[PDB]
Ligand binder design. Structure first.
Ligand code: HEM
Ligand SMILES: Oc1ccc(Br)cc1Br
Length: 137
């Protein structure tokens, strides 16, 4: 289930972070315009950039922290607020986050591992609602 998934993901955090972020950019290429440092670079090029490894690790680590603090896939309002107020998130809307979770859920279903993809879908939906309540457009 959801808690075990956090353990699986945290166990190989960088690899899963890179794979999910790439699944997201592959599914939604226009989203890459938010990441100027990664434009025009192949997957192997990105995986060779310490900047890409560091960014994806730290993003995914915070996502696992938020997931771990949730109760039955309902995140803390304060975690949503952190995400809304981050300067690096200026201009984004709930749609960007919904697309991330669409790609995340799709990745999990295609992986062949036993992720609880329905719980991650619900966690994403609850997090998006929390992001809107905390003021995200
Ligand atoms: C649960 C979802 C998310 C979490 C937990 C999260 C967390 C973070 C964290 C911790 C950072 C700082 C990482 C660093 O040091 O570079 C960051 C930066 C950033 N995030 Fe998010 N993020 C999420 C979703 C998104 C989405 C959906 C987008 C846009 C599609 C986005 C766009 C960005 C950008 C543009 C930066 C700055 C990149 C940079 O400075 O190099 N994030 N995010
Ligand atoms: O910028 C990102 C890095 C890692 C992940 Br997983 C998702 C996003 Br959006």
């Amino acid at each position: 289930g959801f808690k075990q998934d956090i353990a699986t993901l945290r166990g190989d955090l960088r690899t899963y972070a890179q794979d999910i972020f790439l699944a997201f950019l592959n599914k939604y290429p226009d989203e890459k315009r938010n990441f100027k440092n990664y434009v025009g670079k192949s997957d192997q090029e990105l995986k060779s950039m310490a900047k890409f490894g560091d960014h994806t690790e730290k993003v995914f680590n915070l996502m696992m922290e938020v997931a771990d603090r949730a109760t039955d896939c309902v995140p803390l309002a304060s975690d949503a607020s952190t995400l809304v107020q981050m300067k690096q998130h200026s201009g984004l809307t709930t749609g960007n986050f919904e697309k991330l979770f669409v790609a995340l859920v799709e990745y999990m279903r295609a992986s062949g591992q036993s992720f609880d993809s329905q719980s991650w879908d619900r966690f994403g939906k609850n997090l998006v609602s929390a992001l809107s309540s905390a003021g995200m457009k």
